[PDB]
Design a protein around this ligand. Structure first.
Ligand code: SSA
Ligand code: SSA
Ligand code: MG
Ligand code: MG
Ligand code: MG
Ligand code: MG
Lengths: 476, 476
């Protein structure tokens, strides 16, 4: 989430600058105006809460002074009308009233404070609704457009991206007998699949290779929970992700037979989400940064946005394994942006060793999520399909995620007015199911699929040289 | 589920024999009496449906004959009372009535058939409620008791099961820095964990070894869906598993923005469940049997039955990877029981090569699930803990699961009166999280944990010889 002082004119920030970034992202700029209005109404609520505290203390002071002098207390006990306001409840007005009457006034103030606090919580939630759906500040190099096909700038190109081959990944996944779509459609519903035999070893070869490649570079391999609590998932995901991406999990909340309540959880769509929440509410040391993680988890995506899109193969599925790069970086200097170029090259040198052709793409601001400031995608060339397909997404989220999860840059050299949060970045190293599709199409021959040089070590004896065809192409 | 002809006295079966097996399992025998009563009431409903069809055809016959002779049809159109019963609606009674009247009678019969069919469905569902919660026929060698600690017979003992070591798995998981419990408790809720660094490679070594061990023995490695549809999950799991084991998943059911409906799914607790449903509604060839699968999936368990049980380590968790043996066997001869002893020895020779001490246990009938006819558990010796802990469960479910999922033994040599279903078996090869606990406690030294001879091949360079301590023991 963004800093609130940017929305306030009393501080150094300006609301019009945030309105521009919303127009660049091609999203509603009226959320900025709703933010300022709610914050101004919240501010007035705080002034009312302070006045109620001052009047509560003044009521206690007048009683305390009258207890020392020991007034007859009073048996009236009826609340006077001519004193129940901010202007009327004064020191002189409270002096005329008896102890039993002032106690009745304080009780009404106590009820007013609880009502004011309920208003204060409501206004903060109303403010947060607008603040949640405002995207991060964009990098100057990000192309400002809503169209992807036209305005996505190609940065780097590696390998031959014109040579086309025999079969598509759809036919190749069946020919080697490592796919059961019709059976998976009955078991898990549409798009569900069973990966069998040879492709299980290929996936395990990719996982074993990706972890060793990152592990030697200083990354810490990390296996994460596959589901998260609602309170924590809302901090790492936006409202749209709850609508068209995240699965909802229902649990008991307690491991007791007497319990009848239910806790609502959510399946993760990325290793990014749980690793982001790993250092939640923490003060990270500058000396420890940059902390690098090699996330390993199964990802669950509802994929509601696309219907009739890659419905045959394992390219677009509800369930897939993915090795993730996650780096906690220093906010100062250009550390995060230097890491941003470091993480994409780590993904580049990964697919270069596997012999996969690709091009690097700078994604338009309109297709960027609220967290990311700049995204780079590695779109690999698919010879059988004849088109470029997305394999990697590299994003710098800066201090957006860190502010929400309260992950601070715990420096000890300066005393600051505002707390500085760390910079957080996420990039995928290898998406198993989609990487397999890239390997099958690029290494296809007359006999089968040739095992890449780097993956030969992790393949079992008998499948180290090549993965041969055993079934004919699924004909229509 | 069990065969219905066993409950019927008209067939060769006897209900009293099923009452005995329910008492042996220490479960309600009154479900057998409720089954017979519902089946008898269902039988009478079928006789009523046949009579309604005969009267419907008799109404159509009388009209058809009167259409040929061309009667004045009739303008009465009022339904007579003296004919609206099974005894009163006869050929002579329908002859007196006019065409317009008989058409009104047939419409009431059509409404009666729909009401009778609704009763027929209700009675079948009422019959199934009792049939679902009746366990499989027990093997003669299964000990009949409700107590596990007293009556569980120990079959085989391997290795030294008396030698105790320094630290428990709880301390060992933290000392090598591969566990984050407090962080996982915030992310996923209680019992949630992050496995990091060295233990990620250990898990990957176990997965890579278990798949190659089974793959060379004729098993087909299979990656399964992690969630299943309600209709299919109910066929592989009992009502108790929905109460204290299975997580509920909420999805849209359709990948469209216009859709507002929701489909209820369930996370798998075993690879057994999706692999059992793989050959759902199929006719398996005798020549193809035995079909052997090496299941690989993440298992999700709610673990509601146990509170305050192994709450510190990774031994009892909501989420764990597991390699599963699943065999479709021939019902004839002793093929399934020969495979039952083959699958347990496959699990035995697995932990013998890893150098883990254990004993084989025959579990009492009272603790067996509805599917299993006989269960054998491999309880490994834990030196640091000082007790035997469960790692493997080997079960022969026979034709219980196959009847429910309609998986038939498709023979072509004989013409039979009743369809014979295949025998299905399930046994775990390696439960990653619990196997790690067994390795850490058995291979602990002064420096760290020694890498087992078989796992040395799959460990990364630098962690092939030993996994050293980096942190002190979590002291209280
Ligand atoms: N439905 C799907 N089926 C299979 N693979 C997918 C699916 N959706 C995404 N992927 C793969 O997994 C990666 C996820 O990256 S991403 O969704 O674009 N963005 C992120 O989540 C970033 N945190 C990088 O992981 C993609 O690069 C893509 O290769
Ligand atoms: N809550 C848990 N946390 C970690 N591991 C578990 C948990 N529950 C069971 N396991 C492990 O996973 C295995 C599952 O086997 S089982 O539940 O007993 N029965 C089955 O599911 C059989 N189909 C064999 O897999 C057990 O042998 C045990 O070693
Ligand atoms: Mg995402
Ligand atoms: Mg994209
Ligand atoms: Mg089970
Ligand atoms: Mg057991």
């Amino acid at each position: 989430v963004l800093d609130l002082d940017l929305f306030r004119v009393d501080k150094g920030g300006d609301p019009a600058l945030i309105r521009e970034t919303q127009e660049k992202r091609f999203k509603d700029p009226g959320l900025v105006d709703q933010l300022v209005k709610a914050d101004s109404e919240w501010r007035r609520c705080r002034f009312r809460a302070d006045n109620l505290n001052k009047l509560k203390n003044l009521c206690s002071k007048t009683i305390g002074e009258k207890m020392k002098k020991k007034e007859p207390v009073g048996d009236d006990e009826s609340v006077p009308e001519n004193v129940l306001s901010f202007d009327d409840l004064t020191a002189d007005a409270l002096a005329n009233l008896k102890v039993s009457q002032i106690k009745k006034v304080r009780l009404l103030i106590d009820e007013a404070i609880l009502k004011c606090d309920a208003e204060r919580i409501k206004l903060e939630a109303e403010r947060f609704e607008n603040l949640r759906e405002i995207g991060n500040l964009l990098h100057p190099s990000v192309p400002i457009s809503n169209d992807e096909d036209v305005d996505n700038k190609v940065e780097r190109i590696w390998g031959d991206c014109t040579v086309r081959k025999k079969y598509s990944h759809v036919d190749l996944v069946v020919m080697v007998d490592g796919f059961e779509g019709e059976k998976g459609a009955v078991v898990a519903g549409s798009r569900g699949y069973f990966l069998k035999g040879v492709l299980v070893f290929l996936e395990q070869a990719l996982i074993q290779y990706a972890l060793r490649t990152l592990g030697s570079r200083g990354y810490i391999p990390i296996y994460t929970p596959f589901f998260m609590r609602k309170e924590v998932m809302q901090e790492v995901a936006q409202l749209s992700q709850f609508d068209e991406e995240l699965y909802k999990v229902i649990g008991k909340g307690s491991e007791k037979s007497d319990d009848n309540s239910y806790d609502e959880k959510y399946l993760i769509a990325t290793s990014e989400q749980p690793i982001a929440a790993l250092h939640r509410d923490e003060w990270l040391r500058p000396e420890d940064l940059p902390i690098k993680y090699a996330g390993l988890s199964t990802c669950f995506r509802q994929e509601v946005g696309s219907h009739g899109r890659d419905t045959r193969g394992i390219f677009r599925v509800h369930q897939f394994e993915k090795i993730e790069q996650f780096v906690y970086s220093s906010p100062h200097d250009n550390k995060s942006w230097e890491m941003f170029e470091e993480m994409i090259t780590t993904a580049e040198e990964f697919y270069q060793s596997l012999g996969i052709p690709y091009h690097i793409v700078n994604i338009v601001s309109g297709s960027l999520n609220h967290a990311a400031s700049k995204k780079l995608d590695l779109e690999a060339w698919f010879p059988g399909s004849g088109a470029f397909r997305e394999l990697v997404s590299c994003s710098n989220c800066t201090d957006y995620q860190a502010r929400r999860l309260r992950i601070r840059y715990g420096q000890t050299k300066k005393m600051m007015d505002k707390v500085e949060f760390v910079h957080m970045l996420n990039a995928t190293m290898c998406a198993t199911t989609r990487t397999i599709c890239a390997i099958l199409e690029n290494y296809q021959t007359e006999k089968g699929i040739t095992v890449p040089e780097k993956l030969k070590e992790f393949m079992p004896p008998g499948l180290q040289e090549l993965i041969p065809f055993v079934k004919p192409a699924p004909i229509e």
